[PDB]
Structures are given as structure tokens and as C-alpha cells.
Amino acid sequence: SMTRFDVLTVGNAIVDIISRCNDQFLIDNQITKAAMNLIDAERAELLYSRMGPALEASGGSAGNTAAGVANLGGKAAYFGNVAADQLGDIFTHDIRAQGVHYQTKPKGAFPPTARSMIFVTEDGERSMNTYLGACVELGPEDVEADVVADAKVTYFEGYLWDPPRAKEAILDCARIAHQHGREMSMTLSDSFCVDRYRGEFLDLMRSGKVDIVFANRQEALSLYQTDDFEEALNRIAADCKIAAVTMSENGAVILKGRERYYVNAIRIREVVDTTGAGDLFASGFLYGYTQGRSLEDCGKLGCLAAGIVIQQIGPRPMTSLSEAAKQAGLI
């Protein structure tokens, strides 16, 4: 039995800078709504100068997913690179404080720690503007091989295909994980990210480097360049062992071969801020999966965690997911 970790996640280590804005702000600043918009240093300074008073919170898609696993009671670890600066110190504090193993060492102060300026519109949608900074230094040297060897599932972001060398680390992870009889998982991350790396993502799935794939509706449609969601579901099921496809207020569908399991979204009092929804869906799913739960129950746990996170500001739940799971009889 005993493994050190249930879930290792790997991603871009980012601190979020969060502000509300009106619809017009996105138009005026040519920010693509609901997407991850990469920005350079000059653009980061420009947009920040236009941004209202903000709140900061540790983010990073995989970072949030690890934190959610820990919160639910699972044993989690994280690889991601910050700088030796104050923002890096915040990031390091927050993930470790959640009880996630995080030991990736900063390489210097420059490039500085990544930030994402996240603008939340009145509908609760979030539009992200990300300066990768120190994330560009993540590489094979940051793979703690003993950790990957000792984790039931290693999960990574499609977003890692933007920085130059992160993919090399991910291939090393797949090798180690599979040599030790573990599973690999990825999230498609963002529809434009899928547009950038479609062929490579399909290759990861078809070659068996990735066993479990997370997607939302838009990402699945983007993967196959279709407007037919039924086609997207059929094709994703043929390309990976297990696929979990989220559909916002329409819940989720879990696919395995010919098996399909539909899960309802939970009741939401209000959509405060959708930042982190997919990340926490993956937390709940991977927690259930590494606890030996049915695929339906993994879906239920994902929907519970995702529904909780969209009802607060900030991407990591500030309430106990394990308590919520117990109350919900998912346990």
C-alpha cells in the first residue's frame, strides 16, 4: 500500500492580483474575456497602471489543485518555480501552509515571481493577464524523482507548454511515474492554450504519456476544432483512458472507454468569482480517484469543490472542503 503522495501537481507558480472591472474595461484594453492572456513585462506595467485597487492571493492552476487536494485531506506535492523575492515568499508560504510538499528552490531574483492580473466582471467571469517571470526557469532540474516515484497521480498543466523547458520536466515525470506504476494526468488549461499546442496535447494522450485528461467544454471543442460537443466527447474518450469534461452550471461528464457518468453541478448562491473552478474540480476528482472512489463519486467531489470556490474571492477555498464533503455525504 503506502505511498508518500496521492497527487503531485506541476505548474506555473503564480501570485494573483485580483480586481473587479466593468465590461468596457476588457474591450478598452483588448483583454480576451474568460481567457488566459500572456503578457510581457512592459504590458504588465501598463495594465497594472490601469488596474483598480487589488487583492493578492497565491494562484497557479496546478498550485490551486494541490492546495485543494490537501484541504480535502489527501496528501499533495507541488513543483513550480518562483523567484527569491517577496511574492515568491508569499507563494511558498501559502502552499506549504496548506500542507502541500513544496521544495522547488528559487534560482535568483530575476526574472521576478510570476503574477496574473485577474479581472472579474459582474457576471463572475475571470479574465487573466499573466506575466510568466520566473516560471520560464522551470526545467528537468526541478523534478524531484523520488516524489514522482512516490505519488499515485502526477498532474500537470497544458499551460506548461508556454515556458520553454517545462515540457522536458513533464516528459521526465511521465517516464518516472509510469516506470513506478503510477498515473499521469493533465488539464487542457485554456482554449487558446489548446489552439497553441493541439497536436502536442493529442500526442501526449495517444502515446500514453497522459492517462487522465481534464477539459472544459470550450477546451474539448478546441481540441478537435469542432462545434459538435457530442463529437468532442466521443473523440476525447477514444484518445485517453479517462476524461473528465466540465460544463460549468451544466455539471460534468466522466468518460472511460464506452462508460459515461454524468454529474450535476451543485447549488450556487451567487457566482462571486469563477477563478479556480476547473482547478478545484480536478482537486475533488483526483482526491476521490486516489481514495479508490467510483468515477461518479470523483465527479461529485469535483463538482462540490468547484462550486465552493466560485462563491468566494480568490482561487483557493478558505473553508474546509473535507467538512463540506462529509456534510454532503461524499465523505
Ligand X SMILES: Nc1ncnc2c1ncn2[C@@H]1O[C@H](CO)[C@@H](O)[C@H]1O
Ligand Y SMILES: COc1ccc(C2(C(=O)O)CC2)cc1
Size of the site for ligand Y (CB under 6 A): 9
- Look at residue 310 and give its three-state secondary structure: coil
Within 13 A of 124's CA, how many CA atoms are on the CB side?
18
112 binds ligand Y (CB under 6 A): yes
Q: Helix, strand or coil for residue 35?
A: coil
Cβ neighbours of residue 9 closer than 8 Å, sequence gap 6 or more: 62, 63, 65, 66, 69, 76, 77, 78, 79, 154, 155, 156
* Residue 130 binds to ligand X (criterion: CB under 6 A): yes
216 annotated as ligand-binding = yes
3-state secondary structure 132-191: CHHHHHCCHHHCCHHHHHCEEEEEEEHHHHCCCCHHHHHHHHHHHHHHCCCEEEEECCCH
For ligand 1PK, the closer CB: 114 or 194: 114
Residue 315 contacts ligand X per CB under 6 A:
yes
Under the binding rule (CB under 8 A), the answer on residue 51 touching its own copies is yes
In the range 2-41, which residues lie near ligand Y by CB under 6 A? 17, 41
Q: Which partner in ligand Y, ligand X, its own copies, none is near 11 (CB below 5 to 8 A by kind)? A: ligand X
The reply to whether 307 sits near ligand X by the rule CB under 6 A is: no
Task: State the CB neighbour count (10 A cutoff) for residue 77.
Answer: 25
Distance between CA atoms of residues 166 and 141, nearest Å: 10
159 is in an annotated binding site: yes
Q: Which of 70, 77, 128, 149 binds ligand X (CB under 6 A)?
A: 128
Which residue's CB is nearer to K ion, number 187 or number 275? 275
Question: What are the residues whose beta carbons fall under 8 Å from the beta carbon of 303, sequence distance 6 or more?
Answer: 251, 252, 263, 264, 265, 266, 281, 284
Stretch that binds ligand 1PK, among 86-94, 177-185, 204-212, 261-269 (CB under 6 A): 86-94
Asked if 288 is part of the footprint of ligand 1PK (rule: CB under 6 A), the reply reads: no
Angle subtended by helix axes 217-224 and 191-206, to nearest 10: 70
Binding of its own copies at residue 86 (CB under 8 A)? Answer: yes
Instruction: Provide the minimum distance between the beta carbon of 63 and ligand Y in the complex, in angstroms, as a whole number.
Output: 17
Q: Least Å distance between CB 74 and K ion?
A: 20
Footprint on residues 96-115 left by ligand 1PK (CB under 6 A) = 106
Instruction: Print the binding letters for residues 226-265 with ligand 1PK: x by CB under 6 A, - otherwise.
Output: ----------------------------------------
Nearer to its own copies, 57 or 170 (CB): 57
The residue range among 47-55, 212-220, 271-279, 297-305 that interacts with its own copies, by the rule CB under 8 A, is 47-55
> What are the CB-based long-range contacts (under 8 Å, 24+) for 43-47?
43/129, 43/131, 44/115, 44/117, 44/129, 44/131, 47/117, 47/129
C-alpha 205/C-alpha 61 separation (Å) is 20
Could you list the residues that contact K ion (CB under 5 A)? 273, 275-276, 309
Is 60 flagged in the annotation as binding?
yes
Crossing angle between the packed helical segments 191-206 and 229-239, to the nearest 10 degrees: 40
Q: How far is the CB of 53 from K ion (least distance, A)?
A: 14
129: annotated binding-site residue? no
Q: What is the C-alpha separation between 252 and 233, in angstroms, rounded?
A: 11
Q: Which residues are near ligand 1PK by CB under 6 A?
A: 41, 45, 84-86, 88-89, 106
Q: Which residues are near ligand Y by CB under 6 A?
A: 17, 41, 44-45, 48, 112, 115, 117, 131
